[PDB]
């Protein structure tokens, strides 16, 4: 009830090949043509990808900046608070971004700032301002 292991036979394929005296040749020819159609399509995209790879020569090395690793301070200086306010205005709720902008404040210290200086720094207004422009 099974063809030999590796052999391929199906009711659909048998009917399609024995439909007429030239169906067998027609089926094989249409598959042969479809192979050339895909082979030339490969070299076409291979040429397209090769050109795009040249536009990436050098990578992003001349645009790489060194990492300014500084000690994480617990106290907030006037300047640091002002950096936060503008970060909240530009990033919204992305605590990670805000923290990276300041440099010396952890992700938790940022969240604490949101609650501690909520009223005084009109964070409610700043947050809705960000929503109006994303």
């Amino acid at each position: 009830r099974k063809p030999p292991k590796g052999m391929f036979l199906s009711q659909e394929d048998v009917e399609a090949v024995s439909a007429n005296a030239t169906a067998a040749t027609t089926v094989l020819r249409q598959l042969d043509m479809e192979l050339v159609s895909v082979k030339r399509q490969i070299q076409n995209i291979k040429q397209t990808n090769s050109a795009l790879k040249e536009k990436l020569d050098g990578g992003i090395e001349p645009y790489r900046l060194p990492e300014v690793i500084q000690k994480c301070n617990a106290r907030w200086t006037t300047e640091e608070q002002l950096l936060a306010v503008q970060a909240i205005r530009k990033y919204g709720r992305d605590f990670q971004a805000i923290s990276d902008v300041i440099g010396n404040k952890s992700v938790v210290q940022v969240k604490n700032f949101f609650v501690n200086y909520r009223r005084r720094f009109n964070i409610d207004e700043v947050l809705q301002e960000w929503e109006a422009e994303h």
């Binding site: 063809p3 067998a24 790879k53 645009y63 950096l83 970060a87 902008v101």
Partner: protein
């Protein structure tokens, strides 16, 4: 199988069960208690064993009862009934053996047998043994018909039958003990040589053969499971099925090549999208770097808005740099994924030009066995007789197969050079009109009670007919004759003075250039004592080569051999013989095959006797008068010598039963 069970197996009978034939003669036993059936089976099996252990002497009823132990030897009538049944059906006391009870001088009934081939000879010996007057009419100047052996000096080579197929269950095993048959095993090692003359390496030989078997197995699936047996109102042939399977395999090779590319283009397009993303990201990174630089130019001290920038741009540039690295990481994965696919293509072709040529040899070999092009074979029934094959290795008659018929002809009334022209059968008897083949004007009339026709199917197929039947044969008989296939195959005997071939090799093949000529001298046999090489012509080539002269045929044979063993190693043959079975008026082909549109039932129809109408209107239903034997009349063993032999035994029993009565029933 051993003991009494071996005897049943050697007689093609089940040891633990009664056959339909036995049921008909012993209805009282098969319908009765199980115990009685076992008593019958034992007596039957033992009697067979006694005859088989010593087939050179007649096994009489008295001798059988004498060698039986209690309680089986108590019922003397049951033993007699079993013994007579076996004798009448030729299961015991057949062939050539020493007669203990000399043939009674007074004969009963007259029988004319047409043809003195194996089927005709077997039946004649039996009919004579039963006490009937038997005369054989043979057209040729010799006996054996399709068992023809070329003999000149020490050169011996068969032009007709040559192979005995296994001894387990074969009636030829008994014959080989009665006749001086020099049987030799056939070494199955067959090296192949391409058109150029160079051998085919083991790797290719095994790969193609495995594929050949896989292709045949596939056609079976296509027949039994997919029911692809009729196409355009025509029965499907083995060739058509094979063609379809090959084409579908070529199709798969191509549905896999396409798939493998299509996987490349999909990944290739994934690279396109990723590269476009990377290029545009590199642009934004270039832009932000310039903005950061301009912002950094604003020297400290500076207001917090200027300080927000720079730091804000630093963060944005760092974030976008991470994105590029992750995208470049994906580029490396896709790039190598494409290198893997490009290094792992599927198969380019199903079978190369070289592969197809070697495959064509295997098809030619199959065309040889069936003595017909594969496009004529019935897909559904070409292998209907496979379940009845004998166990054991195939052998060859080293002293020529003709020893069998010549031996079976001893003591028989055979009229050679007598070509039957007309067969007349009526309610009161039969008359056969025959002529002298040397001088056609001389006419002979033979009157008889019954006629056993063993004419080859090819002769029966003749149009206009060579042998006229009066009255004409019924439509059911003629339609079978027309449906049944009668193939052809020829042999070229090459006699040399020295051995230039491999002596340890029994046979080697020649791979033809095209599919059309695949069966043209594709196989060479080395089985005889004297330095003889036998070439085979099969398939579509068989019929065509018959119109080609001997000289040209021998030339091609030498050309092939020269290309294999060396141009100087092959000397001009001292003797050459070429068979032409199709042109032969007394054969009109080699043997029957299951043609498309036919079935195993046609063989049964060929075996059915003909009963003439009454001479006087209102007279009782007459006796069957015309009987048929021959290879084409035995469904389970056609196209063989054993089959012919067995068909003769069948008719002899049927005729005797009809004209001498059956006391055992």
């Amino acid at each position: 199988p051993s003991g009494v069970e071996g005897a049943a197996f050697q007689s093609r009978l089940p040891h633990d069960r009664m056959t339909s034939q036995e049921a008909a003669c012993f209805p009282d036993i098969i319908s009765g208690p199980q115990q009685t059936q076992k008593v019958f089976l034992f007596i039957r099996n033992r009697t067979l064993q006694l005859w088989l252990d010593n087939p050179k002497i007649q096994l009489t009823f008295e001798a059988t009862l004498q060698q039986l132990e209690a309680p089986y030897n108590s019922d003397t009538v049951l033993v007699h009934r079993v013994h007579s049944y076996l004798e009448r059906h030729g299961l015991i006391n057949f062939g050539i053996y020493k007669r203990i009870k000399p043939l009674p001088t007074k004969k009963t009934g007259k029988v004319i047998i047409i043809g003195s081939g194996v089927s005709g000879l077997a039946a004649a010996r039996q009919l004579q043994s039963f006490g009937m007057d038997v005369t054989l009419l043979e057209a040729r100047d010799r006996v054996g018909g399709r068992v023809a052996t070329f003999r000149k000096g020490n050169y011996v080579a068969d032009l007709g039958a040559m192979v005995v197929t296994g001894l387990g269950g074969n009636p030829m095993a008994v014959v080989s003990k009665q006749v001086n048959m020099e049987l030799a095993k056939i070494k199955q090692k067959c090296p192949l040589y391409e058109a150029n003359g160079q051998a085919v390496p083991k790797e290719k030989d095994e790969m193609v053969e495995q594929e050949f078997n896989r292709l045949l197995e596939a056609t079976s699936y296509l027949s039994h499971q997919l029911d692809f047996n009729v196409l355009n109102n025509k029965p499907v042939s083995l060739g058509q099925a094979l063609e379809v399977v090959i084409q579908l395999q070529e199709k798969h090779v191509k549905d896999e090549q396409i798939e493998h590319w299509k996987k490349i283009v999909k990944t290739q397009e994934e690279l396109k999208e990723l590269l476009n993303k990377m290029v545009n990201l590199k642009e934004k990174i270039k832009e932000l770097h310039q903005q950061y630089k301009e912002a950094s130019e604003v020297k400290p001290p500076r207001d917090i808005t200027a300080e927000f920038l720079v730091k804000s741009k630093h963060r944005d540039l760092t974030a976008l740099c991470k994105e590029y690295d992750e995208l470049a990481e994906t580029q490396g994965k896709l790039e190598e994924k494409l290198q893997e696919l490009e290094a792992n293509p599927p198969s380019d072709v199903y079978l190369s030009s070289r592969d197809r040529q070697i495959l064509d040899w295997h098809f030619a070999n199959l065309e040889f066995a069936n003595a017909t092009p594969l496009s004529t074979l019935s897909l559904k029934h070409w292998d209907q007789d496979d379940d009845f094959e004998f166990t054991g290795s195939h052998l060859t008659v080293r002293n020529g197969y003709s020893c069998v018929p010549v031996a079976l002809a001893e003591g028989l009334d055979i009229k050679l050079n007598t070509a039957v022209r007309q067969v007349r059968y009526t309610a009161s008897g039969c008359e056969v009109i025959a002529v002298n083949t040397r001088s056609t004007s001389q006419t002979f009339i033979y009157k008889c009670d019954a006629v056993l026709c063993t004419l080859p199917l090819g002769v029966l197929k003749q149009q206009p007919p060579a042998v006229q039947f009066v009255p004409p044969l019924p439509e059911w008989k003629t339609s079978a004759v027309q449906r049944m296939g009668f193939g052809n195959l020829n042999k070229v005997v090459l006699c040399f003075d020295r051995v230039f071939w491999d002596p340890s090799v029994n046979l080697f093949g020649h791979v033809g250039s095209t599919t059309a000529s695949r069966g043209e001298l594709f196989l060479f046999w080395n089985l005889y004592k004297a330095p003889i090489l036998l070439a085979l012509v099969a398939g579509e080539a068989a019929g065509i080569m018959e119109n080609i002269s001997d000289d040209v045929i021998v030339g091609r044979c030498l050309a092939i051999l020269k290309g294999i063993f060396g141009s100087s190693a092959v000397p001009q043959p001292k003797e050459t013989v070429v068979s032409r079975w199709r042109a032969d008026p007394w054969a009109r082909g080699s043997y029957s095959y299951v043609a498309a549109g036919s079935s195993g039932n046609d063989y049964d129809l060929m075996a059915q006797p003909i009963t003439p109408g009454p001479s006087i209107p209102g007279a009782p239903q007459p006796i069957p008068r015309l009987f048929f034997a021959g290879e084409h009349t035995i469904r389970n063993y056609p196209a063989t010598v054993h089959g012919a032999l067995l068909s003769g035994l069948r008719e002899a029993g049927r005729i005797a039963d009809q004209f001498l009565g059956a006391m055992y029933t």
